[PDB]
Design a protein around this ligand. Structure first.
Ligand SMILES: [Mg+2]
Ligand SMILES: [Mg+2]
Ligand SMILES: [Mg+2]
Ligand SMILES: [Mg+2]
Ligand SMILES: [Mg+2]
Ligand SMILES: [Mg+2]
Ligand SMILES: [Mg+2]
Ligand SMILES: [Mg+2]
Ligand SMILES: [Mg+2]
Ligand SMILES: [Mg+2]
Ligand SMILES: [Mg+2]
Lengths: 61, 124, 210, 141, 119
RNA sequence: UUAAUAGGGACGGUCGGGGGCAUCAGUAUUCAAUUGUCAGAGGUGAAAUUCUUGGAUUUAUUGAAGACUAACUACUGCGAAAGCAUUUGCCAAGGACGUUUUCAUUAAUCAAGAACGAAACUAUGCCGACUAGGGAUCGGGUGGUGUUUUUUUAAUGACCCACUCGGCACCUUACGAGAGGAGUAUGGUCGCAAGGCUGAAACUUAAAGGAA
């Protein structure tokens, strides 16, 4: 964020990080760069654990 | 007077010097100078239409700390003003209630904690 | 090989600060084999050459150093005078105007609101500027010092320094484009007879009755 | 409280509370009166007469020592000024300034002071004319 | 040791290196930075002053002088009272060239009262 | 009758970069005269313009002209304000202080009237008839003390402390009836405006260009 807003390097890396985290499932949306601070949380990572995903897929009660 | 780039540079000159040719352009400026520059601009625009209470809020600090922070800062200002007074140095005018903005104010980000002035004394 | 020495008196209020930094001043001057003396009885600072002094012109810079310290310049800023590129200049400003109120307003104009004008000039000229009394003290590179003098003198002649700050900002951008180096930059820059005896006084109403 | 000036000085004499002659004074009341007459005959003004008597003859106040003021003592023996002493001095200060202005025509400051001096003469001359000490037809120059 | 006087005039835009006899009437060698450089922008550079100093130093040794007294000055008058960069560099070059320096003084014209209009 | 911690005048030693007229000095600038040397010198961000082998710039000696009164220069002094900074003399004027000197209410505020008299461009301080103060400083006076000072030539101060009157400001305190901004929308009115290669239209028309 402290790099200048029009920097090509800043935009590239920020999109790559958004691309990767969304693929893992930690981030629900790729639209907003501010999500890297506000919506990056331990609960987001824990919510991708196998027991939780089984619960959401209704494989377990 | 209506040149935005020129007026912006003058108001922000204190921050740019503290956190430093001089990179005053928006694309060149990086680091804390960018973060402190953006916050100052947004506060300036918000002051016109936003309510005074909501726009500016001092960060929560315990009393024994903040009163200590204010006391030490006031002592620094008094030494700075006295030293200039003993010499011939001319200093920028300040309103009665307000604290003078010495170099330490910008570098140490004191204003976010102590505030521009003691609001209780201003109210009475 | 006689020793060349220079002396400069300093105010009593600066005695406390000079005493603390003298070891730093001694160390800085010792690198060039220059001896220094601080007399707190006479309130003077002396710098002299030694038998190991090899740079003939360093004594002049050491003299400027003690002058700056006496004029309330901090040592970290003052010590830079020993560098070859750096220089110091004093600009008189008391003679430009005859009205005290006009003098104060124009001087305050140089400092500007919250010191913004002064800080911007220092940033653009890369000079340390101190406005004191009827003189403006500047320290920095020779190109910067020349620019500072024009702004300070023009300020006392009713030209707002903000015009010079804008002119300095544009000039730096112009210097970075080669195609226009040869071309002039003026286009891009902002543009009855007196009587000795008083008349008589009108009589009061009571005088008329008398 | 100065008129024609911003000064607020309060320097003045403090007449002593008691109105009797000092105990240490041991000179006849009459002998003071002849002393007053001689000085006035020589040409001294009443203010100057009092200073000499006080400085050198132990006369604290003529009224206290003799019971009458110097002005009445002199008038009782035929010595009386043509015009009051304060007006007497004010006219000369105007004359001296006017003489100076004649040679120095560019002294605008002296012109300003001559206005203040003359205005003071008009106020004083008005008072004495009211009390009849000065004849009604009298005018300054 | 034969003593001369090296009169240095260090302006912002140029530097004069001038050596004369003690009286000052007899000029011995006058060399300027503009003589030693190809561009007007570089007359005041320390490099130009150094070149002028060495040539003056070589000429002085030929005449017979082995030492000099230095009298550095600036433009003075109502202008700056500070010598330019060339003055310091020229002074160093003279010592390097081998001429002994006798005494150093600032003789910049300092007006008692400048010809500047208050109005 | 008092002789207002009302007013005026007088006297005593003083204070002032207050005013007027002469007078003196100073370095600087410009010019000129000689004077050594030779190709640059000023100025700009670069230049252009200007001076220059008939000697510029620069060096040394000397003379003249106009202006000015640097550093000392201070949140100091004087003046009603505008303003006033070299020395000496003259001319009057003024402030405060000191007085056991003098007149005795002669005073205060005042529309009218009278005298004097390129620029701005970031600021700002609740106000008053209003209490008690603190430090520093300027001018005067009183007292104390002991260091500078000095001695029957004449003059005869500086510093320290205490009090007091009057000033320029600074930091504090008790009291008082002191009676529009920022925007949004527009089937209205008035203006400005779109386009299609130019030549080239009454001419499907040349050369040369534009685009590609
Ligand atoms: Mg009385
Ligand atoms: Mg009087
Ligand atoms: Mg007197
Ligand atoms: Mg006088
Ligand atoms: Mg005079
Ligand atoms: Mg003259
Ligand atoms: Mg004069
Ligand atoms: Mg004075
Ligand atoms: Mg005054
Ligand atoms: Mg002087
Ligand atoms: Mg007082």
């Amino acid at each position: 964020s402290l790099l200048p807003p029009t920097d090509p390097f800043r935009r590239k890396h920020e999109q790559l990080l958004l691309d990767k985290l969304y693929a893992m499932g930690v981030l629900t949306t790729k639209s907003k760069i501010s999500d890297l601070e506000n919506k990056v949380t331990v609960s987001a990572i824990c919510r991708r654990r196998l027991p939780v995903i089984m619960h959401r897929l209704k494989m377990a009660e | 007077q209506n040149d935005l780039e020129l007026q912006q540079f003058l108001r922000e000159s204190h921050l740019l010097s503290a956190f430093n040719g001089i990179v005053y352009q928006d694309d060149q400026v990086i680091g804390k100078a960018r973060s402190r520059t953006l916050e100052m601009r947004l506060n300036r625009l918000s002051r016109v239409n936003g309510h005074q209470d909501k726009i500016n809020k001092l960060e929560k600090v315990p009393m024994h700390i903040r009163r200590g922070m204010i006391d030490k800062h006031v002592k620094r200002i008094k030494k700075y003003e006295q030293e200039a007074a003993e010499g011939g140095i001319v200093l920028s005018k300040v309103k009665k209630g307000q604290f003078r903005k010495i170099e330490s104010t910008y570098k140490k980000d004191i204003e976010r904690r102590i505030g521009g002035s003691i609001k209780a004394r201003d109210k009475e | 090989a006689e020793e060349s020495s220079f002396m400069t008196l300093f105010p009593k209020y600066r005695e406390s600060y000079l005493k603390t930094i003298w070891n730093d001043v001694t160390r800085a001057l010792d690198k060039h084999n220059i001896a220094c003396v601080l007399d707190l009885v006479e309130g003077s600072m002396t710098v002299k050459t030694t038998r190991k002094t090899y740079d003939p012109a360093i004594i002049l810079k050491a003299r400027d150093l003690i002058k700056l310290l006496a004029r309330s310049v901090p040592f970290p800023q003052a010590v830079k005078i020993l560098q070859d590129d750096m220089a110091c200049d004093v600009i008189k400003i008391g003679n430009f105007v005859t009205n005290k109120e006009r003098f104060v307003k124009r001087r305050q104009r140089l400092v500007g609101p919250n010191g913004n004008t002064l800080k911007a000039l220092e940033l653009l000229t890369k000079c340390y500027i101190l406005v004191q009394g009827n003189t403006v003290s500047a320290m920095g590179p020779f190109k910067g010092l020349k620019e500072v003098r024009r702004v300070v003198e023009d300020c006392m002649k009713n030209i707002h320094p903000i015009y010079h700050i804008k002119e300095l900002m544009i000039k730096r951008e112009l210097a970075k484009r080669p195609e226009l180096a040869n071309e002039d930059w003026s286009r891009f820059l902002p543009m009855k007879v007196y009587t000795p005896f008083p008349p008589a006084q009108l009589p009061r109403k009571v005088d008329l009755e008398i | 409280g100065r008129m024609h000036s911003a000064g607020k000085g309060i320097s003045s004499s403090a007449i002593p509370y008691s109105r009797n002659a000092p105990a240490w004074f041991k000179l006849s009341s009459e002998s003071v009166i002849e002393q007053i007459v001689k000085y006035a005959r020589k040409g001294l003004t009443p203010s100057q007469i009092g200073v000499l008597l006080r400085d050198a003859h132990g006369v604290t106040q003529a009224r206290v020592i003799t019971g009458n003021k110097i002005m009445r003592i002199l008038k009782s023996n035929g010595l009386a000024p043509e015009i009051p002493e304060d007006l007497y001095y004010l006219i000369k200060k105007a004359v001296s300034v006017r003489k100076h202005l004649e040679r120095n025509r560019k002294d605008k400051d002296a012109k300003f002071r001559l206005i203040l001096i003359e205005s003071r003469i008009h106020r004083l001359a008005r008072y004495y004319r009211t009390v009849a000490v000065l004849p009604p037809n009298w005018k300054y120059e | 040791q034969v003593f001369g006087v090296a009169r240095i005039y260090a302006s912002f835009n140029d530097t004069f290196v001038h050596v004369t006899d003690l009286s000052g009437k007899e000029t011995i060698a006058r060399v300027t930075g503009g003589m030693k450089v190809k561009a007007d922008r570089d007359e005041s550079s320390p490099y130009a002053a150094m070149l002028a100093a060495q040539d003056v130093a070589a000429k002085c040794k030929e005449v017979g002088i082995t030492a000099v007294h230095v009298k550095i000055r600036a433009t003075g008058g109502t202008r700056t009272k500070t010598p330019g960069p060339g003055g310091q560099a020229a002074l160093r070059a003279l010592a390097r060239s081998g001429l002994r320096i006798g005494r150093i003084e600032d003789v910049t014209p300092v007006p008692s009262d400048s010809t500047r209009k208050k109005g």
